[PDB]
């Protein structure tokens, strides 16, 4: 199943991006006066609300590499959601042409 | 219909998450000085703008369990939207191969 390979890998990729992104955000934001994304617990929640595109604004990067990490977290969460949605649609379609009599 | 089972259950799940999430957010935010997500009416609107990923930033949790509840509200609204979109696509596809002559 190709659609389950792409969705399954993207979700694994997303988890790696969320954890590494939380780590790399703190590493890139510290050293910049005024930054508030400087502790791992709340940086872990920031990566989730970034990947899900919620983006409250309570937490955000101010540096270049912090923003580059943010972009990666944005793209990873969006593409993973696009692949899973696509994989679900083909799963339902193939399931629907079955149950009738089409294999 | 499997795609209507998954979309129909997800929307029901979303309503449960929205109501319980509004309740659990207030319960988890009270006791934390500075929290503003501490009354049920506006916490009910916060769960909607969280599940829809709008996230104005007028309201957001500051505690651990408040943020954990927020994550659940984020994921519930996103996956429900992914299943309904998938269910619509298969519904249109099956409707399109009909009307021609394919059953």
């Amino acid at each position, epitope marked *: 199943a190709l659609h389950w390979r792409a969705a399954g890998a993207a979700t694994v990729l997303l988890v790696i991006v969320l954890l590494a992104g939380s780590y790399l955000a703190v590493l890139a934001e510290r050293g910049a*006066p005024g930054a508030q994304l400087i502790t791992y617990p709340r940086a872990l929640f920031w990566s989730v609300e970034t990947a899900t595109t919620v983006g409250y604004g309570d937490l955000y990067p101010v540096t270049l590499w912090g923003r580059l990490v943010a972009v990666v977290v944005m793209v990873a969460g969006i593409t993973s959601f696009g692949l899973v949605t696509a994989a679900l649609a083909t799963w339902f379609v193939g399931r629907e042409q079955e149950r009738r009599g089409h294999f | 219909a499997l795609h209507w089972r998954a979309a129909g259950a997800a929307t029901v799940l979303l309503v449960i998450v929205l109501l319980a999430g509004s309740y659990l957010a207030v319960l988890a935010e009270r006791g934390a000085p*500075g929290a503003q997500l501490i009354t049920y009416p506006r916490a009910l609107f916060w769960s909607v703008e969280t599940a829809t990923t709008v996230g104005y930033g007028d309201l957001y949790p500051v505690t651990l369990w408040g943020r954990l509840v927020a994550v659940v509200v984020m994921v519930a609204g996103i996956t429900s939207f992914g299943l309904v979109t998938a269910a619509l696509a298969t519904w249109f596809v099956g409707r399109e191969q009909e009307r021609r002559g394919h059953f």
Partner: antibody
Amino acid sequence: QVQLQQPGAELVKPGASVKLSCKASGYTFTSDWIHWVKQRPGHGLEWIGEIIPSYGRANYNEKIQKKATLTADKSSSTAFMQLSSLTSEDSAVYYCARERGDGYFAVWGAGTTVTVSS
Amino acid sequence: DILLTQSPAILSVSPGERVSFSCRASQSIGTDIHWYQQRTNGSPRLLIKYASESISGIPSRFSGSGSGTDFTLSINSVESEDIANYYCQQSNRWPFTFGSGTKLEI
């Protein structure tokens, strides 16, 4: 079981340098930050800089003059601070502290009494 | 940066009396304040992390409160071992800063 072990004291000639150490026992996570705090006799706590040994990146106090250079050795779990070009104004007690990346200094060292005199 | 002002410099109190130190920040820092104790010729010791939450090993005698720009460390019934220097530290913004300190005398 001192988690952060520092030498007792260090004597430095005016204008010379010294390499302070901070051997770390206990749990050593990849999210650990080692902070260095300067304290003059009869004075308060002053933040010098931080370093994450798992990555090797260090930050410093911009409001003061850069006298320190932070390094680390993951194989021996020991962070180092290089105080160069010392005057009498650099004579103080230098602590090292371990932060779990959650903001607070959970464990401190005994401090090293650095004296700059001829 | 964020300056932390501690008042008063020296705090006199009778034994068995509830005392309170004050830590105030230049700007709103939520609850990201931490309290430390330093006795004579000793190293700082964490008493309170994140304004109000306690630390294992530290007596229930110590308690903290406040949010925004006004923080308070309280001691129910001060005894002789409480005589030390008390500091507050913020972690809300980079860089971490310390308070000027408050000495306790009985």
